[PDB]
Design a protein around this ligand. Structure first.
Ligand SMILES: NC(=O)c1ccc[n+]([C@@H]2O[C@H](COP(=O)([O-])OP(=O)(O)OC[C@H]3O[C@@H](n4cnc5c(N)ncnc54)[C@H](O)[C@@H]3O)[C@@H](O)[C@H]2O)c1
Ligand SMILES: [Mn+2]
Length: 435
């Protein structure tokens, strides 16, 4: 078995330790000779890196390890780039969430004007990583599990069409995990599914066990009463529960949880608090906890000084990496150019659909024609995403106003323009200039 060189772009991330623990738990299927951290925030990364340094010397001292702010040192001699950056960090996520809310619109990490703003910040950053990877490790694959993938994937499709980038999302993985528990299967890998949509905007059409038995009837009966809350944090519980109402709009399918923001934006605004948003919760909890536990590890010189555990969820990252590395043909939902897969939908749209993954990347499976309801929703939203990338590319104020105006989350062109002017003011150091 061969060994792999990985570089984590976003070393300063609070998820880095959990992901590293995950990788160490998967040395049997994905052996590593080298692990590197890269970040543009040195001081923030140093705390994470020095703590991970202790963990690595305990569990796997044969893995060569280093951290840096230098692209050349980071991207040289790697097989994979795991990109989980958050341009602007939590202070900007806080703005994304509160600015729309002062105008009576939902503020969310990847949906609505908040997500649009995060997408406008993220495009530039990701194009940089892609360029670094191609310059120092031309044969490397980038596993981009950063958000907001619908906007960033549309940018890379347009500007780096041939780059070896794999766009993947964990939301479907988490939902499938809950589905598996609801029907009573061991795990999600005991299911074979069909699905279509945009990232954070899709539907399961077929859900079966490996033998082909239909699991849909049981899921319908259950989700119709409790949503994706299986028989086994407050904000997420509500999202998973609200899927009850979202699934009700099309009883034949199962929906992606992000559809609640588009079908019930009123509900979201009503149950929000413009003083304390999700960013505030993470900042005062997960952010402070991980950095604290990391300084505790460095100061004590022992991992047990911290309470960092394996990030089980993140496992799907290794599934993707092994699929590429060992040409496994594993079936998974990836974000790829449509080009006929959804026959009655724009060829140049980025869609989240089943693909077989091998050494050449994905081989997407056809989907067929989709119904008017989903087609209408996706046509509206994909127009939003394409106008955002248009605004970015052409440095156009007017394209971004169009984009925000088109969103199902935005009540009118006048409110859209007010939100836009506030987002511009708040993102002065991250967005290109708009004329
Ligand atoms: N398993 C996971 O890591 C996971 C889970 C859910 C969502 N996400 C998504 O991944 C992204 C990262 O979120 P997170 O919570 O893991 O990270 P985080 O918010 O805990 O930290 C982000 C890190 O990325 C760094 N960064 C920002 N811009 C950069 C650039 N241009 N170059 C290099 N580094 C940069 C920041 O300095 C910071 O250290 C988000 O979009 C999030 O929605 C990741
Ligand atoms: Mn996602």
């Amino acid at each position: 078995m061969k060994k792999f060189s990985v570089v984590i772009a976003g070393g300063g991330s609070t998820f880095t330790p959990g992901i590293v623990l995950m990788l160490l738990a998967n040395q049997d299927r994905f052996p590593l000779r080298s692990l590197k951290f890269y970040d543009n925030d040195g001081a923030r990364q140093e705390t994470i890196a020095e703590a991970c340094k202790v963990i690595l010397k305990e569990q796997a001292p044969e893995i060569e390890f280093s951290y840096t702010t230098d692209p050349q040192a980071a991207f040289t001699d790697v097989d994979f780039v795991m990109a989980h950056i958050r341009v602007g960090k939590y202070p900007m996520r806080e703005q994304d969430e509160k600015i729309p809310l002062r105008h009576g619109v939902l503020g969310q990490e990847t949906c609505g004007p908040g997500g649009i703003a995060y997408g406008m910040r993220s495009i530039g950053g990701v194009l940089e990583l892609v360029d670094y990877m191609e310059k120092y490790s031309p044969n490397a694959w980038m596993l981009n599990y950063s958000n907001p993938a619908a906007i960033v994937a549309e940018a890379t499709r347009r500007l780096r069409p041939n780059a070896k980038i794999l766009n993947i999302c964990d939301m479907p993985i988490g939902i499938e995990g809950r589905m598996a528990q609801i029907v009573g299967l061991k795990d999600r890998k005991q299911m074979r599914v069909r699905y279509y949509g945009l990232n954070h905007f899709g539907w399961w059409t077929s859900i079966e066990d490996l033998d082909g038995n239909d699991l849909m009837p049981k899921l319908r009966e259950y989700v119709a009463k409790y949503g994706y809350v299986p028989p086994s944090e407050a904000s997420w519980n509500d999202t998973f529960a609200k899927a009850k109402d979202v699934q009700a709009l099309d009883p034949q399918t199962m929906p992606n949880t992000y559809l609640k923001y588009y079908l019930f934006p009123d509900y979201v605004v009503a149950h929000s608090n413009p003083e304390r948003t999700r960013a505030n919760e993470v900042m005062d909890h997960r952010e402070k906890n991980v950095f604290s536990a990391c300084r505790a590890i460095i100061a004590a010189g022992k991992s047990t000084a911290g309470d960092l555990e394996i990030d089980e969820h993140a496992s799907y990252i290794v599934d993707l990496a092994t699929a590429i590395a060992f040409n496994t043909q594993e079936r998974m939902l990836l974000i790829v150019p449509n080009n006929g897969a959804i026959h009655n939908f724009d060829a140049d749209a980025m869609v989240e659909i089943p693909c077989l993954v091998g050494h050449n990347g994905p081989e997407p499976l056809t989907v067929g024609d989709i119904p008017h309801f989903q087609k209408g929703l996706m046509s509206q939203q994909v127009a939003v995403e394409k106008l955002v990338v248009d605004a970015w590319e052409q440095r156009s104020y007017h394209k971004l106003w169009q984009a925000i105006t088109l969103s199902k989350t935005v009540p009118s062109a006048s409110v859209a323009k007010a939100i836009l002017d506030d987002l511009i003011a708040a993102n002065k150091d991250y967005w290109p200039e708009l004329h």
